[PDB]
Design an enzyme around this catalytic site. Sequence first.
Site, PDB file in Angstrom:
ATOM      1  N   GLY A 120      38.270  64.072  49.559  1.00 29.82           N
ATOM      2  CA  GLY A 120      39.259  64.615  48.645  1.00 29.82           C
ATOM      3  C   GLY A 120      40.391  65.361  49.321  1.00 29.82           C
ATOM      4  O   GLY A 120      40.654  66.521  48.994  1.00 29.82           O
TER       5      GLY A 120
ATOM      6  N   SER B 130      43.765  64.559  49.479  1.00 25.68           N
ATOM      7  CA  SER B 130      45.123  64.235  49.060  1.00 25.68           C
ATOM      8  C   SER B 130      45.826  65.393  48.365  1.00 25.68           C
ATOM      9  O   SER B 130      47.041  65.318  48.158  1.00 25.68           O
ATOM     10  CB  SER B 130      45.121  63.013  48.132  1.00 25.68           C
TER      11      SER B 130
ATOM     12  N   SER C  27      32.113  78.166  46.239  1.00 23.84           N
ATOM     13  CA  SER C  27      33.015  79.123  45.617  1.00 23.84           C
ATOM     14  C   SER C  27      32.277  80.423  45.342  1.00 23.84           C
ATOM     15  O   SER C  27      31.079  80.428  45.049  1.00 23.84           O
ATOM     16  CB  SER C  27      33.619  78.574  44.318  1.00 23.84           C
TER      17      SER C  27
ATOM     18  N   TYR D 142      30.346  73.583  36.397  1.00 27.31           N
ATOM     19  CA  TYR D 142      30.988  73.683  37.704  1.00 27.31           C
ATOM     20  C   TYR D 142      30.222  74.626  38.626  1.00 27.31           C
ATOM     21  O   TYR D 142      29.885  74.261  39.758  1.00 27.31           O
ATOM     22  CB  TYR D 142      32.442  74.137  37.550  1.00 27.31           C
TER      23      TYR D 142
ATOM     24  N   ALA E 102      27.196  75.580  38.447  1.00 29.87           N
ATOM     25  CA  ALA E 102      25.890  75.005  38.756  1.00 29.87           C
ATOM     26  C   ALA E 102      25.968  74.116  39.991  1.00 29.87           C
ATOM     27  O   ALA E 102      25.144  74.230  40.908  1.00 29.87           O
ATOM     28  CB  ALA E 102      25.359  74.218  37.556  1.00 29.87           C
ATOM     29  N   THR E 103      26.971  73.236  40.043  1.00 30.11           N
ATOM     30  CA  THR E 103      27.081  72.312  41.167  1.00 30.11           C
ATOM     31  C   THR E 103      27.495  73.029  42.447  1.00 30.11           C
ATOM     32  O   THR E 103      26.956  72.743  43.522  1.00 30.11           O
ATOM     33  CB  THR E 103      28.070  71.194  40.837  1.00 30.11           C
TER      34      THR E 103
END
Lengths: 241, 236, 241, 250
Positions: free
Chosen positions: A12, A14, A140, A153, A155-156
């Site tokens: 990711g 870009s 994060s 979010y 959780a991941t």
Amino acid sequence: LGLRGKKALVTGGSRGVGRGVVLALARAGVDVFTCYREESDASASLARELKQLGGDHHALRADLADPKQIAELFQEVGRRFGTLDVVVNNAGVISHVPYAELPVAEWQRIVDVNLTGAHLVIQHAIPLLGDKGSVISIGSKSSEVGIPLRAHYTATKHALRGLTRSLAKEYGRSGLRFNVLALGVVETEELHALPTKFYSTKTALGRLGTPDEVAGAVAWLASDLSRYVTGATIHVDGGIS
Amino acid sequence: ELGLRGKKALVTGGSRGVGRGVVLALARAGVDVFTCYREESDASASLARELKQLGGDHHALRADLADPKQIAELFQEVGRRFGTLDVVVNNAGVISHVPYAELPVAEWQRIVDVNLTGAHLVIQHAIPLLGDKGSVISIGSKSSEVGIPLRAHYTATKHALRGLTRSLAKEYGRSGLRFNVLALGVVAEMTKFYSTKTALGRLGTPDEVAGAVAWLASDLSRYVTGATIHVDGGIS
Amino acid sequence: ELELGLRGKKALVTGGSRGVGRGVVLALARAGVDVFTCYREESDASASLARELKQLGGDHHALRADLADPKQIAELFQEVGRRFGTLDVVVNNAGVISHVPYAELPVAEWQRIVDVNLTGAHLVIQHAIPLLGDKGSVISIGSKSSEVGIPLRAHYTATKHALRGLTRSLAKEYGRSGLRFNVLALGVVETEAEMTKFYSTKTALGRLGTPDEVAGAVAWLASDLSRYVTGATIHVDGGIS
Amino acid sequence: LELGLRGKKALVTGGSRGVGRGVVLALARAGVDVFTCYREESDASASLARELKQLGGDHHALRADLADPKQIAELFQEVGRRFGTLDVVVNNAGVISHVPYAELPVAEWQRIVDVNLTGAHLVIQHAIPLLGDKGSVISIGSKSSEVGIPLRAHYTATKHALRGLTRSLAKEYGRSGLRFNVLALGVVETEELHALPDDERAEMTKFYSTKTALGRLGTPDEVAGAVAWLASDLSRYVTGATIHVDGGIS
Ligand SMILES: NC(=O)C1=CN([C@@H]2O[C@H](COP(=O)(O)OP(=O)(O)OC[C@H]3O[C@@H](n4cnc5c(N)ncnc54)[C@H](OP(=O)(O)O)[C@@H]3O)[C@@H](O)[C@H]2O)C=CC1
Ligand SMILES: NC(=O)C1=CN([C@@H]2O[C@H](COP(=O)(O)OP(=O)(O)OC[C@H]3O[C@@H](n4cnc5c(N)ncnc54)[C@H](OP(=O)(O)O)[C@@H]3O)[C@@H](O)[C@H]2O)C=CC1
């Protein structure tokens, strides 16, 4: 530091943090392989700039929600690079949905990209890292704080810490280091909106983060100056909340 | 005290191990206990009997939590038999010991579907039934902080439960719902490998888990939310 | 079996004349626990405390003792030995705080915060260990703020965080002796307009805490329902930031 | 991506032996002017001063017992007088002992508190006026303060206190250009190497390597790699954090 000549994969790359890390590693002399989900203006300008710099860089479309496409992405990583020194799991998605209204497919989308995708990227990259490699996953600070409307979010992003911690134990004696970067608030495409202070009040430094400052930490974890650092969560958040 | 008598609870994975201990302890305390299991076994039949013999409105249904519509069915039956819930215990989980490089994507998906998506879907279905006041307890692990080779997929899901719980705590706190995680430790040349790591020198029992579960289900913990409560004997 | 079983126990709670300690003392007493408590100066708070403890019939004791002085901690525990003989529960609640800019913090103010909050808590535990015998639950009052950080109070959060490091080694050292040690990480608790809403916005529950809510956690840690809980930091903070 | 360390001025407390000696020498070889201190005149301190002299530029090693606030004031008189400015501060001086907690005398508790917690606090407080509008304060912590170790509760109490100190100082001075961080260390081989051998030939090394993810102890130079990053502008957005340099030990 000694990054010149290394080979790195950055998912990711870009936009935002990924684009800053990719470009910063490339200007330092790292051969950077990056990917993105869809052909847009950002990836086209990314390829244009990657070519303008001297190095063996590549930018390929790859939807990390599809394990087939991860396998194809690593087929040509092994074809063009043959080895990797640094893997940077940075690709991720987010959405603001009230938890009771969160559809199962949107839960599955966030899990498939942020968690299952990073896991599959790591799993494919293990054979190519060899005797020595550094795996960095973007976490994060918010997963410790908790943010409404983004439980899927956080959780991941918190799962990446549990994944990294066990992987560091399993592959430590093989020469592979696994770590997480805990990010605060980084300014990315806030430039696309119109009237920052809400989050600057929460930081200790009084300013939002910059993708190049994340790159400064990534460069340290890529370097042998951090060779005794594994299984750790490194906060690059300006002391936020 | 705890004031548990009369309240209604859903405990997933109550046929064996930690779940069976929590179910049976909550039942003996006067809590109406709704539990589920994945496969009809001697443990689930023994469970259904012991529940049926207590002075309680207890139920044990089959529900494979890797199947979202079996979860929806489970909650249709909870909504008909209980109507409401006071406490939910996300206990059901699976684990396997696989070399990470050899871990097939299906076994990865299975651990995610049961340990992570299952806990999320159970919570999502239970929020309407909890009403204005409720306590959701999710079973985590101290191992997700230590790291364990051959089980990175397991520690990934158990640590995900903390990130989920912290955001749900902040989203539903003002609605009267509390969300917490119980970080568990290890529950003879195996007992002592783990005993040596503990501060108390012994392994844990399901009923000691029930002691923490009971506290989080009571109003004595009414100002406790978004927390990870360690019930691990000080291990590692 | 799912009962606290606190009737008949003996407890020591430091700083029980005001605030959190007063709530913990009265809650334990009303539950049939014989409470020994201390305070630093004769006020009407201590006089009110003694009068109310007499009104709640029980073997309760409230003496003056400045924890900054190791001589008075020793005598406090001679009195505890005379009157109780044994202990089941210890609550390190006494502590002081000041808002001083770190550059202007005098050495004596730093040292007094250290003497009361840390050295005093340590001497209380060291004296109490013989009295607890085969079985005892030690509880120290920490703060969530030592994880967040608060300007003008780096000395306060230094001592409150130190209690966690003390507790965790103490649990390892005395676990097989039947002694449990834990920390209650407190949020913002109502005690002695703008501030209430300022902190309530940071909680998940939207309200500040009560001393009796702290007592609910103390009651659990004093009970056999927490017999496998030791070396833990239990948060009683309403999910504050 | 460069560490711009050449020309900076650093204060590293307790630099005569062990981790601090590794950090002093590594920073000095990188072109950092290093001010360091030690508690007693030994052959370690004399060897350090001589090896600093073989390098350049102006490094200084002065005796200063940090359990004594007057000697910390002396130390910072000499720093402001020979340097006038600081860019980096490393709180490395520390002591440890094994005492059964029930046997722990009050003067030994007070000694560990005076050096590991009050000493570091005074060093930071005296160093802030010299750090100005840009500076980096690193305090050496320990992974053991979150695992807990018998017979060393007084040590882990002080090492964990440094985290709480650091986090609030980061909030207070972050907008002034000062950053504060903790390095939580694992088991770093020092002159462990003298309490040889069988006691050391694999009893100590093997017992601790088993707990690590990498299967080996740390070296002072690997700590210096982390000190280097935190001293650099590559970490200019890192503050109030605890960085683990522990080989994944647990
Ligand atoms: N923004 C912030 O404040 C901070 C970000 N983070 C984390 O940093 C990381 C970077 O996110 P951020 O820069 O903010 O947002 P981005 O703008 O970078 O959006 C996602 C990036 O990853 C790519 N991406 C999204 N989905 C996929 C997919 N299936 N497959 C491949 N690539 C995909 C995107 O490529 P494409 O253009 O094709 O979509 C894009 O480059 C995230 O993981 C985020 O959680 C956390 C705290 C600070
Ligand atoms: N395995 C490890 O090494 C670990 C290291 N740490 C921390 O790293 C730091 C240094 O560790 P280590 O390399 O073993 O240090 P050492 O124990 O080997 O030596 C301590 C150094 O501090 C000096 N110093 C200066 N002032 C004082 C003073 N008042 N009192 C005591 N010493 C003073 C000492 O000088 P002098 O020569 O006169 O004694 C000496 O140089 C410590 O703070 C420790 O807590 C944390 C976790 C593990």
